[PDB]
Amino acid sequence: HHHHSSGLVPRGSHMSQPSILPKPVSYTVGSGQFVLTKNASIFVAGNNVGETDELFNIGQALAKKLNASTGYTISVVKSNQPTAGSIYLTTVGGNAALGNEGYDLITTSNQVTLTANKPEGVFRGNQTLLQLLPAGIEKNTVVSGVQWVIPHSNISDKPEYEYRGLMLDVARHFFTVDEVKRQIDLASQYKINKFHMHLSDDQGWRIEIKSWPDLIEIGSKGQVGGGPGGYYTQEQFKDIVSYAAERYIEVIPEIDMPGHTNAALASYGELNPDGKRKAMRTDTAVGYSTLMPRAEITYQFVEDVISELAAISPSPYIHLGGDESNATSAADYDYFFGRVTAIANSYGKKVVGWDPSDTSSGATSDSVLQNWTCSASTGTAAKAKGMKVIVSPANAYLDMKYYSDSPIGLQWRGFVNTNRAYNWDPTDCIKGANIYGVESTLWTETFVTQDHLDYMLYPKLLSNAEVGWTARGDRNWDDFKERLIEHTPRLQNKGIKFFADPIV
Ligand SMILES: CC1=N[C@@H]2[C@@H](O)[C@@H](O)[C@@H](CO)O[C@@H]2S1
């Protein structure tokens, strides 16, 4: 038999017809179609009144999306007696083998029925439902001249990995609450279920800490390149968390330590050996900054930050970073990371950290390694300690240029086009580990605007999202590529300023 790899498309990027992404476990089409009309209602039914109430909220979210493009006013009804032309969302009799995020979605001529184990699975299934309707449905304004049909069809689905995340760096360049909400919203439509906020680094500190107010008053006032910066009040952070929660997305906040700490060091002189504030940094260098590993003030500072962040962050996880501590000795890093892990645990939080943080003698089996290096020896400690691992290889470093000539992006992990972002498996990055999942990382050294974020995340994130969701045996670039071409109008309709990748 004959095989080949994909080259660029001759003559440029290519960028009744559903466009499901990620690919679901099964999808069959039968004869006939359901028509969504102005008289349609969404019926919801759970196993008890509490669950029905949660489903009702999910139903309202769905109705909102449908109404924006159809111009209809679909409303939601708590009833297990749906009428012809209804969408029906239920958790009664879910197939347990599909787990918390799984669902069946069956469309007949008279009814769309989504059957899940949990409200969360109804939400994920609703993302598929939106992809079964014609392109145009994802418009934010009313679309005319399109019949709102769904083919008679049967889908069963569930994720391969539990953790399927996106990280946004808001330290290097700041993005507004609206901008962040939008990225969370867009990601949610592709079954991304985790959002990691990189809230602090050398060039900026982005979260209000009431006990150390100069973190904002001084530390938030810039960013890479000398723009004005910005920050989230604790109320704004809670608002982001709440917005993500409506989409069954866990928010994991990161305060990077002991390295990548210049913004803190520029805010409080007492955090430095000479007692003087550091000058703020607006360049893109890394690895030079450190907290004082052997000063108690450092641990008081960390505790105050953790105390305030834990109070406003319901995720059982806090990310404490631990990357590129090149100004911290191995011995001091081991000690520091163990101490701050003990502090986080005292505040009821489990710690996530970049490699090599798993090597700290203070880690526990509840700690999580974010494995970015993906080398033969990375996460040896994590594996021995029974720690879950989140993988972020080059293929998930979405800040990398698509190509040599990309106008934005970095290239220290090489180039990452849409094909590279697809053609990998988590088991490639680490062997013999409990792989919790995947996280796509959008660092922002070179991204200033929302358009830059869109360009780099789309279509790259779509590839990563499928790697997290779809089983490896069902993934195939030639298949995905053609599906992505089909999906293109939907990206346009959502107002996403994606890159028309010539490999698609
Ligand atoms: C673990 C991370 N540490 C660094 C980040 O702060 C960014 O500079 C990123 C850019 O790709 O590079 C490395 S990867």
Side-chain angles (χ1 to χ4, degrees), residues 172 201 260 286 323-324 354 372 397 399-400 410 412 443 445:
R172 275 46 180 275
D201 211 287
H260 286 276
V286 307
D323 60 311
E324 298 175 335
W354 306 105
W372 60 285
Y397 263 60
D399 62 316
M400 291 311 118
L410 296 182
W412 67 273
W443 301 103
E445 275 82 357

Side-chain angles (χ1 to χ4, degrees), residues 74-337:
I74 297 169
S75 64
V76 185
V77 177
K78 303 180 173 174
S79 163
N80 73 346
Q81 297 173 63
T83 241
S86 303
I87 296 166
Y88 183 44
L89 311 182
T90 190
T91 48
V92 179
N95 190 326
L98 302 178
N100 288 356
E101 300 191 83
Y103 62 88
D104 292 304
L105 178 54
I106 296 173
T107 297
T108 62
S109 301
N110 289 143
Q111 189 170 305
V112 177
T113 303
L114 197 173
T115 309
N117 296 303
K118 305 284 272 289
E120 183 182 8
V122 179
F123 183 79
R124 303 285 179 243
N126 277 164
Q127 312 315 304
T128 298
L129 181 47
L130 265 286
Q131 290 170 159
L132 288 180
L133 284 148
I137 201 67
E138 57 290 293
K139 217 86 168 63
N140 302 131
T141 55
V142 179
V143 174
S144 65
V146 176
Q147 195 185 190
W148 302 116
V149 299
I150 304 170
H152 190 293
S153 52
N154 190 143
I155 293 151
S156 74
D157 205 12
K158 69 173 192 66
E160 188 74 358
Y161 292 93
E162 194 178 350
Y163 191 102
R164 302 174 312 280
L166 167 65
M167 186 205 83
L168 181 66
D169 174 0
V170 294
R172 275 46 180 275
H173 291 94
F174 180 72
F175 297 90
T176 63
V177 169
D178 285 348
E179 287 167 335
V180 173
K181 287 182 170 174
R182 178 171 170 281
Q183 296 296 334
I184 292 164
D185 196 43
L186 295 173
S188 75
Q189 302 157 5
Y190 300 100
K191 302 187 179 78
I192 293 302
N193 68 346
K194 310 288 180 193
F195 185 64
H196 164 192
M197 295 194 78
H198 185 88
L199 292 165
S200 64
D201 211 287
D202 289 314
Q203 304 93 337
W205 184 283
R206 306 302 178 205
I207 185 73
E208 169 193 26
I209 304 300
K210 296 181 171 165
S211 52
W212 292 75
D214 286 336
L215 294 170
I216 290 321
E217 280 317 303
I218 302 172
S220 77
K221 294 302 171 59
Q223 66 193 13
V224 168
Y231 75 105
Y232 310 113
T233 65
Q234 301 194 175
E235 289 304 321
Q236 289 173 316
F237 181 80
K238 291 190 301 191
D239 189 28
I240 291 165
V241 170
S242 178
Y243 191 81
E246 291 169 3
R247 289 142 186 84
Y248 296 86
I249 288 169
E250 185 183 16
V251 175
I252 299 91
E254 182 189 346
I255 303 301
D256 200 342
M257 54 183 75
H260 286 276
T261 40
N262 201 78
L265 300 172
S267 302
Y268 284 93
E270 56 258 62
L271 292 180
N272 302 269
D274 67 8
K276 298 178 249 194
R277 291 177 180 96
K278 289 286 178 175
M280 290 283 278
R281 292 282 292 264
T282 62
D283 69 321
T284 59
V286 307
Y288 59 85
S289 51
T290 185
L291 300 182
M292 295 185 293
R294 302 289 174 166
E296 286 309 317
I297 189 54
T298 300
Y299 302 101
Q300 183 57 258
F301 175 79
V302 173
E303 177 155 0
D304 291 336
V305 172
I306 291 176
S307 179
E308 296 200 28
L309 188 61
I312 67 175
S313 183
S315 166
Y317 295 101
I318 181 177
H319 199 307
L320 295 181
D323 60 311
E324 298 175 335
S325 298
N326 300 341
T328 314
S329 73
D332 283 350
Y333 180 87
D334 188 75
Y335 172 90
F336 173 91
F337 215 82

Side-chain angles (χ1 to χ4, degrees), residues 489-501:
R490 298 176 186 266
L491 302 180
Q492 298 166 357
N493 288 165
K494 294 171 187 193
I496 297 171
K497 302 307 177 169
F498 61 90
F499 174 49
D501 190 335

